[PDB]
A paper describes a structure:
NA is a homotetrameric transmembrane glycoprotein responsible for cleavage of sialic acid from the host cell membrane. By blocking NA enzymatic activity, neuraminidase inhibitors (NAIs) prevent new viral particles from being released from the surface of an infected cell, thus stopping the spread of virus in the airways. In this study, we applied a set of experimental techniques using recombinant NA variants to understand the molecular basis of development of oseltamivir resistance in the viral N1 neuraminidase NA2009. To decipher the structural mechanism of resistance, we determined crystal structures of NA2009 mutants in complex with oseltamivir carboxylate.
Two variants (I223V and S247N single mutants) crystallized in the centered orthorhombic space group with two molecules in the asymmetric unit; the tetrameric biological unit could be reconstructed from two symmetrically related dimers. Residue 247 is located at the edge of the enzyme active site. As its side chain is exposed to the solvent, substitution of serine with the larger asparagine (S247N mutation) does not induce changes in the protein structure; the RMSD for superposition of 390 Cα with the wt structure was 0.133 Å. Nevertheless, changes in the structure of the hydration shell were observed. Namely, N247 is involved in a water-mediated contact with the oxygen atom in the pentyloxy substituent of oseltamivir, an interaction that is not present in the wt enzyme. S247 forms hydrogen bonds with two water molecules present only in the wt enzyme and not in the S247N mutant. The effects of the I223V and S247N single mutations were more modest (approximately 30- and 20-fold increases in Ki, respectively). The entropic contribution of oseltamivir binding to S247N NA2009 was almost unaffected; the value was within experimental error of the wt value. Rather, small structural alterations—such as loss of a dispersion bond with oseltamivir in the V223 mutant and changes in the hydration shell in the N247 mutant—appear responsible for increases in Ki.
Author numbering:
A (entry chain A), B (entry chain B), C (entry chain A), D (entry chain B): 82 to 468
Amino acid sequence: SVKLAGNSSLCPVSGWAIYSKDNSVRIGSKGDVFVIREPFISCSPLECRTFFLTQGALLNDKHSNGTIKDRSPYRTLMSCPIGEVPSPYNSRFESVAWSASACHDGINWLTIGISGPDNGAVAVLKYNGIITDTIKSWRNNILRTQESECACVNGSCFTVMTDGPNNGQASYKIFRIEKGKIVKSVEMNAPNYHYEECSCYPDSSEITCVCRDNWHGSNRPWVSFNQNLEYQIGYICSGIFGDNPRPNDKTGSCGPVSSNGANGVKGFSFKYGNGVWIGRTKSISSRNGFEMIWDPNGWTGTDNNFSIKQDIVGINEWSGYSGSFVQHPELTGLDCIRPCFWVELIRGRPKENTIWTSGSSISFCGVNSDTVGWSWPDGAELPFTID
Amino acid sequence: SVKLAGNSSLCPVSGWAIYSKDNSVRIGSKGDVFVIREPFISCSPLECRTFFLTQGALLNDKHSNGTIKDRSPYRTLMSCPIGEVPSPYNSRFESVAWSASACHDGINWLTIGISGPDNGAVAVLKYNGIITDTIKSWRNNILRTQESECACVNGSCFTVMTDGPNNGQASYKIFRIEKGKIVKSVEMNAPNYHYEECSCYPDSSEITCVCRDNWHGSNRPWVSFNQNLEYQIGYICSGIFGDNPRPNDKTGSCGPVSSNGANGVKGFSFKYGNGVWIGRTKSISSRNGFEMIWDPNGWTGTDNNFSIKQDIVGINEWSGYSGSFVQHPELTGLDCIRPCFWVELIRGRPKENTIWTSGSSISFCGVNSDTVGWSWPDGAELPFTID
Amino acid sequence: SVKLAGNSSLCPVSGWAIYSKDNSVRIGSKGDVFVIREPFISCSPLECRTFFLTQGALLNDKHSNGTIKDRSPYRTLMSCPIGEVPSPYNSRFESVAWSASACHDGINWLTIGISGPDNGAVAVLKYNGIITDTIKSWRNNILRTQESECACVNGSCFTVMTDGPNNGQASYKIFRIEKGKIVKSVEMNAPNYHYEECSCYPDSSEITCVCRDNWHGSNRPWVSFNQNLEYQIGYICSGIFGDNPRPNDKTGSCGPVSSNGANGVKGFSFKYGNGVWIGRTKSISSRNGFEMIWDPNGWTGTDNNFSIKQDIVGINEWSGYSGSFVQHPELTGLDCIRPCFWVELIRGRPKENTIWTSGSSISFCGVNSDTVGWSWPDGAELPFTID
Amino acid sequence: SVKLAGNSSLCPVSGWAIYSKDNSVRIGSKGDVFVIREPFISCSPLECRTFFLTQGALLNDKHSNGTIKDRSPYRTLMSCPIGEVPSPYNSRFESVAWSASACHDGINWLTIGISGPDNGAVAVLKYNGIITDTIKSWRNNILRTQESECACVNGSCFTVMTDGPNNGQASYKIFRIEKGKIVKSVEMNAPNYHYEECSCYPDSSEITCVCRDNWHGSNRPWVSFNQNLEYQIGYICSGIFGDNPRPNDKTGSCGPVSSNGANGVKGFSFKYGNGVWIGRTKSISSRNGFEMIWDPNGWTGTDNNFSIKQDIVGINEWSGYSGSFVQHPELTGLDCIRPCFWVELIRGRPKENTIWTSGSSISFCGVNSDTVGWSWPDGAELPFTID
Ligand SMILES: *[C@@H]1O[C@H](CO)[C@@H](O[C@@H]2O[C@H](CO)[C@@H](O[C@@H]3O[C@H](CO)[C@@H](O)[C@H](O[C@H]4O[C@H](CO)[C@@H](O)[C@H](O)[C@@H]4O)[C@@H]3O)[C@H](O)[C@H]2NC(C)=O)[C@H](O)[C@H]1NC(C)=O
Ligand SMILES: *[C@@H]1O[C@H](CO)[C@@H](O[C@@H]2O[C@H](CO)[C@@H](O[C@@H]3O[C@H](CO)[C@@H](O)[C@H](O[C@H]4O[C@H](CO)[C@@H](O)[C@H](O)[C@@H]4O)[C@@H]3O)[C@H](O)[C@H]2NC(C)=O)[C@H](O)[C@H]1NC(C)=O
Ligand SMILES: CCC(CC)O[C@@H]1C=C(C(=O)O)C[C@H](N)[C@H]1NC(C)=O
Ligand SMILES: CCC(CC)O[C@@H]1C=C(C(=O)O)C[C@H](N)[C@H]1NC(C)=O
Ligand SMILES: CCC(CC)O[C@@H]1C=C(C(=O)O)C[C@H](N)[C@H]1NC(C)=O
Ligand SMILES: CCC(CC)O[C@@H]1C=C(C(=O)O)C[C@H](N)[C@H]1NC(C)=O
Ligand SMILES: *[C@@H]1O[C@H](CO)[C@@H](O)[C@H](O)[C@H]1NC(C)=O
Ligand SMILES: *[C@@H]1O[C@H](CO)[C@@H](O)[C@H](O)[C@H]1NC(C)=O
Ligand SMILES: *[C@@H]1O[C@H](CO)[C@@H](O)[C@H](O)[C@H]1NC(C)=O
Ligand SMILES: *[C@@H]1O[C@H](CO)[C@@H](O)[C@H](O)[C@H]1NC(C)=O
Ligand SMILES: *[C@@H]1O[C@H](CO)[C@@H](O)[C@H](O)[C@H]1NC(C)=O
Ligand SMILES: *[C@@H]1O[C@H](CO)[C@@H](O)[C@H](O)[C@H]1NC(C)=O
Ligand SMILES: *[C@@H]1O[C@H](CO)[C@@H](O)[C@H](O)[C@H]1NC(C)=O
Ligand SMILES: *[C@@H]1O[C@H](CO)[C@@H](O)[C@H](O)[C@H]1NC(C)=O
Ligand SMILES: [Ca+2]
Ligand SMILES: [Ca+2]
Ligand SMILES: [Ca+2]
Ligand SMILES: [Ca+2]
Ligand SMILES: [Ca+2]
Ligand SMILES: [Ca+2]
Ligand SMILES: [Ca+2]
Ligand SMILES: [Ca+2]
Ligand SMILES: [Ca+2]
């Protein structure tokens, strides 16, 4: 039982091999499956788990009514084994939460679950299931976090939280956590940037996060930092815009791209020097489809050329959030940190005529062997009996 | 594998961080969730479990009919992991019981489950799931116990049991138990006192219990004792009255407060010198709302002044029983015993137009970091299909 | 990990403390609970399990139709933790079977499951879940076994099987089994005796079985034997008759009591020298009620006097099969083998107007501390939705 | 924790003892049971598991509609303990797949799950749940594999895959896999042969596979090979034809038997010198009944004589796929590899008037002790509520 080192580089990847699919919404038509959104995957040295925010209700029951609503006292962070449906009969209780993050340092699970009122929310940090720290809203305006895994390097785990407007300048802080206790934090000095829902991973002892600008950017902002929280900030420069909504691909910017910049979706990308692996929706205007694109100069260069595209979900099918996750060498036995990703397939409101909103999930792992594009969509037939 | 020492003091706490919420009644609208009441939490050195008294029936099924009834041969003590719904598919069987207690000494679980007729009930003690002792009613009038966790100190666990009227003078005994065997007991000499449903915890090698006077007290009675069962008794002196029902706050007493004193609700409080942390309903007349109040002189002083109030459940929402539980240093790695508490959110009869009565639960742990008041209510929409 | 010794004597017991209740039929009204009959309890050095014969169907589903029928290719022997309902979601698969036995030698589980046609049935023996032996019908007329636990002493386990008529002279064999392999067997020379459904236990290195005479006895036959299968046979002499049906209590016999002797119910008794602890129905004519009676001279003496009766299930409530089980000192830490028992509470056909037949269960352990009589019946309201 | 040697011979068997029956379809009428087909069994040194291809849907739910369809993005490989129903509450997620294989090398599980489009499908290999390799379609025409267990010998596991037409000459490759990585492969040079759905087992350090000719053979093709993938090929010569459909028994061939040769069913056989144990349907024209036949010269001789037949499923009852599985000496403690087999009992479309297709399963292990013929059919009553 040993701390993850986090000191090897990301593995080189040519393509993405399908890892899991839970079919949660299809199964929940009959079975006892939680209404969920904001799922994410995180791994220990022994296993991979799906974390998710329940709505304290099951699919196809009357208590799923009104689950478009983001924040309530009923929402809880729970987890289950990867690829299994999230049920009351197979899910571990983690925290009371309407925003969350989680990660394993090699020894125990850290979970961060935020609840409370919009004007004074509190993040509750747990290590091995025991409360180890709290942090309260510092701008009194919806303290919130990643909705994907935190990142760990040599016994320290790292996350980003936001507090303030979702449609204007807000406040962004980076945290270093050891055994569930906050040991350091810093406010990012990012005037004119907007960071929401960061997808962070370790690479060569440093953390890279690719986030959502909900204010005025259709490209994604990034922040990277070392273990002392010395950071750098920027936006992905590629004209292959990564947010949803966005414009058609054209010449990009290393600052926020204003065209179609308001609103957004949680997402991710993996940096390889000047290059980038971008996961994005297929539709420029809606949460539909998903694809992976390799742009060899897209981290720093503004053209809209790219070299590989792999289809994940077809343009006519519902998608949603996505996030990164990694598998450390302590799990895989490889000599590098393996990049992986998950996609939330959102069903229900606002786009479909149901009383509820819920998601299923798919995930993929990066490989250098042969792969293929396809579409692996949610597959449920809506509406349901309850609607 | 080592016995809990129980020799450190209670941790100092400024406020309460949310720890769990099971949403049992919401989920049970569709899922297979036991009808339960009298839930409580207790921890080992490895995990925290919810114990509860089933009615041998599931929510939204005809066998939930008439579950306002307290004692039957169908009620069982069972347990599940904290925060999970109590289902037949995730719950461990403990004992046949219509009143119960349980606690872990560091090595194994002790459960105490009382069943049989009102005029001759028998407590069955189990250690590691094996029957180790029994004790039979000594006044032939509903032998009954805590409905929350027993308290353990250096291999010995301690509980309190009552036998006799619920509306006049009864008989109260303290027990010391080792490996599931009663090794000592004493009858408390408490004329004019009434003790029901004690919430007991360890603090510096001694046990303190805060209980319910169902006869003629709207403040709570207490009993404290050492390992040889040498005890002291009194009532909480604060004019911040702890029971439900109760009068509006005014000058208190350190005997039983007769105004609104008949009837009651199980509750708890934590003593810190002359001060007290009081958990109570918000309503003076019904089991609605919940709040935590820090009164720095409330154990021994009679004024109705207090320094901190933290909201837990809104005044218009259903609450119910509450109890203490602790997390020992052997679980947390701290240097003190961490006080925590649970609240039962009772749904159905007598206050709502259903055929059934059941509860869900919430819990909190004491911290010295930032916290916030809110309302985390049950959230089910009654009546149900079966009603 | 060590073989059970089986060499200490049965513990002296004054009365019976309630150990489990599963409420299976009440829960199965909504939940996913197997239709079962012929349940029984057996323990390892670490835990106690409920074994049972499913009908390959769930309660309140159409496939429960016709489950009065004893033998089919759908019946399977499965097991779950004691006191939990038998569900597809918590039950371990053991064997394909319409008659069964099971026991733990201290190292692994032995299961014996008989299936096949009436004219050529085969017992499949499994040790640690792996097929270790078979034995085929030797009279071609419903090879059948205990429906309760086998008995183990120093690495050998022992059982009894019958083949031939249920209403006349049949053939009875005793088996010694080591690591799932039959190492010895003998045919009992018992002209004019009838043995069905033996309840066997260890006591001081020897096995005692108390069985059902379905031909012409309203008292119970017994067989006892050592590890070399040197046996003795008799009938319980007490005028406190043990079978169902039976006459009113009167002077008994050490041979089969012909009055009301045909038909029967599986049951048990525990021998203490000349004395006996008898479990029986309360009704002389029907499977209703249950009671424990201590008759200090009832093993060898024919009077109808007895000294203790303890009520278990009221005379107006449904009962059914019962059987012995033991808890070895390797489990309990005691210096003797603890006698325990279980009762099957049969619901449905033939006595009630349902399409199905199923049972729930209760169990008790022998103690020398205080106990009480009561009634702990099944408690389901019949008929069900499906009927 | 040690690799399976795989160097002992197959155990001699006189007959087949029933090992498991899951009753999945019966139970799924009410319970939450996956729609599945292509089940198979495989064992580790500690346990036996059922693997299966879900349709991402539950029985008696609308999403079971159209499950006659073989390949979709919703199908997943999952596994549960042998004999238990495949539910979302007891099943481990393995891979996204519409064709699969799995096997344990003594240390960890290998799973192979093929998904993607018909013209470019990709097999994802996982070792201990971690992606270790991929292989992509080489003829762009439904890359596909065994639907039963792979075979392991001294740390290397072996499988066969087909790519190309199901009704004419296709391409067949053998693979050697170590810790989930392909280390060797070879294309079989088998003009005029057709290999689908191979049932492979180890015997004396070499692998033998018995497969389905879907093009023009009513007898079964075989391939056998050593660890360096040096192979031999032929067809089972017995006039006791093994496929379904097939002609009535008559003089056979050791090439493909053209009469009734098109189409087929997955099956198996076990070679013992010149002899063979053949599992087959009872019907020559449809997937009904099942029987085991010992033909002492049937591997290499063409007559239609045989020595032993054991009934498994009656001629009027539904059967389906069948496959081999083995129990190694490391699991059993025997000195030889124990042959066992499973049968899929297919319910629904095309033969029955439902919207869905699913199966249940039975399994048997080879013994030299007494056995018996019977019928252990599926037993569900179709149609269901949803139909
Ligand atoms: C939960 O429990 C409640 C309480 O038992 C139950 O509600 C009751 O349902 C029964 C059956 O519908 C009702 O009983 C009837 O009452 C009427 C008068 O109101 C009588 O006329 C009926 O008696 C006639 O019918 C019987 C059978 O045919 C005859 O035996 C009898 O002699 C009469 O001819 C019968 O007593 C009862 O009124 C209600 N009570 C209330 C308060 O609603 C409820 O249905 C249960 N729910 C579930 C889901 O279990
Ligand atoms: C399982 O799948 C089957 C196959 O899809 C499904 O059975 C089908 O149900 C649908 C809906 O009831 C039927 O479709 C209708 O067919 C009639 C003629 O028979 C048409 O007139 C209907 O079209 C009208 O209505 C539509 C909606 O209002 C309009 O969009 C349309 O333009 C028309 O006005 C409609 O197409 C279909 O006939 C059956 N098919 C069969 C073979 O039974 C079944 O219900 C599914 N079951 C479950 C549980 O999912
Ligand atoms: C409050 C800002 C935040 C990020 C833009 O909105 C999120 C957007 C969401 C969305 O765009 O789907 C759903 C999230 N559950 C919500 N987060 C919270 C904490 O309410
Ligand atoms: C019998 C006295 C006792 C304490 C006042 O009543 C309790 C009150 C209850 C209550 O006030 O809600 C419910 C408890 N289940 C009941 N206890 C038992 C054993 O019946
Ligand atoms: C076949 C004789 C046997 C013992 C008398 O009948 C049993 C009686 C039964 C009974 O009296 O309830 C139910 C048992 N399931 C049945 N056993 C079998 C194997 O069918
Ligand atoms: C595609 C050829 C293949 C072997 C003949 O067809 C199989 C026949 C089937 C069958 O005959 O029942 C069902 C299998 N699920 C299918 N395999 C796939 C991958 O689709
Ligand atoms: C990474 O950390 C490991 C584990 O402590 C260390 O042994 C090794 O030198 C480092 N790897 C590099 C520099 O690639
Ligand atoms: C959904 O909730 C709203 C608000 O309480 C209510 O008015 C409506 O009837 C509900 N609908 C259903 C179908 O449950
Ligand atoms: C990792 O942290 C430990 C603290 O246990 C520290 O002593 C060590 O130097 C760190 N290692 C690296 C490679 O930074
Ligand atoms: C508490 O008990 C521990 C464990 O035995 C002991 O080592 C320690 O001295 C005790 N401390 C006090 C202050 O009693
Ligand atoms: C019982 O067997 C034990 C275990 O081997 C042995 O040590 C002991 O002598 C025996 N007990 C008796 C005779 O009571
Ligand atoms: C019970 O089974 C019989 C025999 O198949 C059948 O005729 C009857 O309709 C069934 N009844 C129900 C209610 O399922
Ligand atoms: C128990 O059986 C063993 C076989 O391992 C034998 O050698 C030993 O003598 C037996 N002990 C008793 C007490 O009979
Ligand atoms: C089989 O392999 C085992 C395990 O390595 C070895 O000890 C044994 O000699 C082998 N036997 C034969 C006959 O190859
Ligand atoms: Ca944006
Ligand atoms: Ca570019
Ligand atoms: Ca009171
Ligand atoms: Ca005060
Ligand atoms: Ca259900
Ligand atoms: Ca009889
Ligand atoms: Ca007598
Ligand atoms: Ca063919
Ligand atoms: Ca032949």
